[PDB]
Symmetry: D2
Subunit: 386 residues, 4 copies
Amino acid sequence: YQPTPEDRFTFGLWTVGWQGRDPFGDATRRALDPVESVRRLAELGAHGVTFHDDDLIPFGSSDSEREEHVKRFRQALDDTGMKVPMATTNLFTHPVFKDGGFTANDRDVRRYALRKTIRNIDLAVELGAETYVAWGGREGAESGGAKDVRDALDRMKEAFDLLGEYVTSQGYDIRFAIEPKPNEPRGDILLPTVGHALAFIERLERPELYGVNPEVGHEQMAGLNFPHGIAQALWAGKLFHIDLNGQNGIKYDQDLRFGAGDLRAAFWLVDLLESAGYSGPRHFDFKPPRTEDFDGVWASAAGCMRNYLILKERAAAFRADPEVQEALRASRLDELARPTAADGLQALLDDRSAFEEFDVDAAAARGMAFERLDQLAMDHLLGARG
Amino acid sequence: YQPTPEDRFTFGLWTVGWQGRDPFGDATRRALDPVESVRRLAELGAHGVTFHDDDLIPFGSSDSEREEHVKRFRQALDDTGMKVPMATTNLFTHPVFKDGGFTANDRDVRRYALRKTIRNIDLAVELGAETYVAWGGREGAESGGAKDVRDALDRMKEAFDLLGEYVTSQGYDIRFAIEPKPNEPRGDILLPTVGHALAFIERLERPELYGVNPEVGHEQMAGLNFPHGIAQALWAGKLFHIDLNGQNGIKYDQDLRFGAGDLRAAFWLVDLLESAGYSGPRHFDFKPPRTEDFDGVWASAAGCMRNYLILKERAAAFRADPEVQEALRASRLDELARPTAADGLQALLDDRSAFEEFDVDAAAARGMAFERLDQLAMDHLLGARG
Amino acid sequence: YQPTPEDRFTFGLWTVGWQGRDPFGDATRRALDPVESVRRLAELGAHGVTFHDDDLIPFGSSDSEREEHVKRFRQALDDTGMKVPMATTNLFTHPVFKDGGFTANDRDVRRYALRKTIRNIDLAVELGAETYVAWGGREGAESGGAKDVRDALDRMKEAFDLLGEYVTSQGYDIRFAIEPKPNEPRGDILLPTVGHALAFIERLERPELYGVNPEVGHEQMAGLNFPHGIAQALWAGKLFHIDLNGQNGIKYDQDLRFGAGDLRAAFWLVDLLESAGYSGPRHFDFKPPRTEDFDGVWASAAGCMRNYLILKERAAAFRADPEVQEALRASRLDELARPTAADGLQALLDDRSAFEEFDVDAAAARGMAFERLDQLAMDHLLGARG
Amino acid sequence: YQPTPEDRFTFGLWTVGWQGRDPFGDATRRALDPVESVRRLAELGAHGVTFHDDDLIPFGSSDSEREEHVKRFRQALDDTGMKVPMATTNLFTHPVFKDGGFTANDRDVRRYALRKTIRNIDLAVELGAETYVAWGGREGAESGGAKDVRDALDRMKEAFDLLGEYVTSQGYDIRFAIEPKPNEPRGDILLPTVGHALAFIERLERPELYGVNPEVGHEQMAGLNFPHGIAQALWAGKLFHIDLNGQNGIKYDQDLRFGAGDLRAAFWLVDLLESAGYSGPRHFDFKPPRTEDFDGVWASAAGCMRNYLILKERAAAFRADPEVQEALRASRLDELARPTAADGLQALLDDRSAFEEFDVDAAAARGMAFERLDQLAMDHLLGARG
Ligand SMILES: [Mg+2]
Ligand SMILES: [Mg+2]
Ligand SMILES: [Mg+2]
Ligand SMILES: [Mg+2]
Ligand SMILES: [Mg+2]
Ligand SMILES: [Mg+2]
Ligand SMILES: [Mg+2]
Ligand SMILES: [Mg+2]
């Protein structure tokens, strides 16, 4: 289970670079030079890295300081063959963003947030990013009166519309991905789930430019089924990027390494991504626990890719197993894929076998055979044949 | 706080009529005649009632039996002045629907579900309903392999598209509302939240015919902020109906009377509905606890309306209080409602005060004053002036 | 992975016998004769069965009817070699228990609940049960004022104390196990977690007679770590029985087959039970989903035992792997097992290396190496060596 | 609703002093001098303040630096009349505690944690504290293999036993309170709920010295009913201290001001505390949101006390209302307080009215009248009479 760049595994600089500061504790690890993280991740078999503007260029940096940081980073990318498929803006760390960026109540902050974002869009394009992610981690509220959500959604639309006008006017070949999170650090965050993000995108001026960047742990913080949500995003044609990690249920955002947390959900996710032929980066937005020294950082990062590759193998074996294919037919997964009424409405209405002569009791008595199928899935996941 | 039909309070027959059967217990109350519930609810000041087909017409009923049940019901509506603003289909109780209705794996069940739905759409129109609700309570799965969600969403779209073709071809003045629920009775239900439902509607052939029917407790079963979700639905122009009740957090669907559960959320919901001028029914989808006899049923139903009316008064006092209006300005709610960059993209880009000369530290130092505002909201809710 | 009676796998009659009635749906399966379930479970390799009084003897049965049901059941146990290690009382289904049994507000109901319980204790002893479980599923409240919890806990203590006086006076060799559940069917249930149950037991007159019967899914309905809670119960010497099933997070009680739900938690549970040498029944309190016909019932029941046995093998391989044993030392699990200050308080106080000369920065810099250990655990679970 | 020191409202230095650093953001407020917080809180009507050792004495401080910080603090207490009823140790911020203090795998860290705790116990006694709180925020794990919970509980017992031996040998009049939290910052924290803490205390050598310090938001992070848990703690005689704040459901620890979050739960809590005559400090462990400047800090702190006092008034009016007293009788709260079988076991067994002649159907038909009672409680909370 050795990854290669062909597997398109990507990591954020802020992931392996997380110093271990949490709400109750100081950093347990020194800062990592981005150049060092690029080199170490390349050695592990990663395909590329991603960055917030402020991960790469310290906030407040001069234009010449900015130039030197980018040059050194480019050199490490050239030395390693690592790509930068995705970039994003930090609109959450600095105190100015304490009430949000795009939907801050203060208008001057919203304009600043846009300008900070645009500056980094230009850098992302220069470094070759195809996807620009927006995680509005400070967009939201702790109290009901602080935020009129209709006005906030107007401001969010306005912001994304202006970004879309910017990238179009510049001729940039880059698309946007909205990353939902239900809460944390705000008490409730706007666009809290994949569904809310999808719905919002349809009200943008140029919806084709926007997709979602769902995160495993974020949807699971609302107790939702992450493979189900990814399926809906794929059905909508909007899965532009994906953030992979682990989460043990409804609690603070743990950002465990992928495969940790809900393992069965990870299996079904990989099954879906591979079956749908998702072609984008497999990006890990995770935090090596602050219990770990640097050797644990790289072990946790390695484990992300390892677990993906193990699950890929098991999901492929599951789908290729003739006993499973027969079980899917026994559970009528084939019938689910056929149209209900390709004969059309009038034919349905005139079809007495669909109502007047439908034997509901005989249909009710048919077992779905789902537990046999699910145990075959369990056996395959655990490598107990099937 | 006495309700009148002018308040547009509506109840489902299945609410006051719930016999108290839960997963671990038999009925504690005898069945209510729908005619009796209409009369009792009218006496309480309700505006109208809603029904599943199977609440009103026992499943398996003859066409003549069906006729007599409808005639008796119409008579009680004529005697009381009660309206029927909304109707829905029971696609969840009968065993034939154990794997769903519209997205059952068995194709013959899906066709039956459509025909059962269409039959009731005709009845709803005859009784004057404006909104036809669809709660796909059995659409979903307990296991990953049982349901290919992309195919299920194709089948769900197909079903709703066919219903839209039916109502258009019949010339019916009725709109559809999708009611999301994250789980229960299925392990995960498709279209689990308002956001997912909104996103799905945009992929229907005639999206204008479809809105959402969010339920307080359902969104709170995913830990989401119900007023936030309603705000998004209103912003999208899709709040066609609303189900009001109470829920104590992430657990089984409690269907407590409205005002119970998260009281502050109820306050902010009423504030929003009244401020947005929501004109639709205030419908209670609640269950009088099975601890109650019939006197408790009517007391709980009365309490639904009472709590709405109390919260309406408090929310109105909050918004009318000059000290609150000043506090909203102090927190820059006025600024949130102004466009970020009505001057347009190029002006924003050339505006040095938006980036190069923006004093981020002075903006960061500005307090939002949200806690003062929220305590004014608390004081108003509790009737401690403000 | 074929179970034998030596594995001590037990099932409740109500598990495979669940007819599929849920809050929103009728039964999908006919009733199973208890004699038939005993025979089918024996064929699957189960060790024994458990029962509520009302599973075995229909409520309201005559003494002669009661006699005939018990005789037929005994015959099937004699024919199959199946044991009855545990029995319990149904104090939740009948409407009389709608506000509880032992803590019902009505005193006459509480006395009835005790007498119904005692009658079944005598039957349990006659059938050879060693453990008598009490799941107070109706003990609790939906509203704050309905239940004074201090008085309810007095009534709960009184009930359990009287049962303990009964079994002592009769000379019965039977112990009690309290089964916690946080909610459902009551809005909040008293003694909601293993911890609450443990704490309560210490206030009983004869605490030695009482332990806990934790259920996987119940603790996970509060988002708690089930292996952690079992560890505390084992540390207290109070793990008298255990209910095994699966649960996908904080939602309604799903009672999925064991191994479903949180698979990693299942692995760590088995690891703990086997490492601690838990000798009691491995009892499955699960529901075959109502999507299943009888073949699915037996497949789901079989899967319970299969998954236990697979996880047992993986957990044993994990613990036996020299690379894992070295990793445990690297993470200082050995040091966790040594006393902190066996030298005693005064020696600790005088030990300058414990404070005045303790190099906190060098200790802070030591990595815990937990992520490497956890990936070895993952590799073992998935059968990817280690 | 003006508080006076007679109301025994206390605040942690770390509450109003929280600088606003969260997992995703820098501080938004400068550090507060503890002397300044004491003065400002006294002006607001607080009774006293509490502290972690490291809030008051910067970590690493010299003995003379330590002396000067304590002297300045004492002076502000003497100037203001403020008391210090409670103190605690910071065993969570410094990296050395990244795997815990009392249950760190490294033995030298556990000995250091004890010595750091003992040093502060001496200071707490000198400043007049009656309660010494222990919040083991780093005691726990993110992964199953990192922490053998039986050994960790041995180490936790050993630690608390040694502290109890220390305070006894010194003759200190101080008691210990364990503060449970289910998770955050560890993935799962040991002793996650009030129940677990209560159960653990009973295994200590001197259980009389230990109680619980439950926090509103912590129990609600497991979805539990906080008044229920407080009731159990009171029933056990173990409510030594209480931390008051607000929490919006199962998510990260929000530490909202008291009254925010679940308002009905706050009402029932106050009702219980006042009805039980809880005499201890009403301590607020809350964080003014990082959106606030210092004026918002004091407004949020003021709101804590205000909301307690409003709820106290409403709960008192509820209990004093003759209509409520009649409703409690109608719901048989009086009967709940009478013994079930003061006549004893043999009398119960011979009482045919308790089983053979008990009319279960007539008892089943009795309504509990809980919804009427709960609406009276709602009316009182909202000041709509009753
Ligand atoms: Mg995350
Ligand atoms: Mg992410
Ligand atoms: Mg509901
Ligand atoms: Mg509803
Ligand atoms: Mg269960
Ligand atoms: Mg159980
Ligand atoms: Mg807290
Ligand atoms: Mg606290």
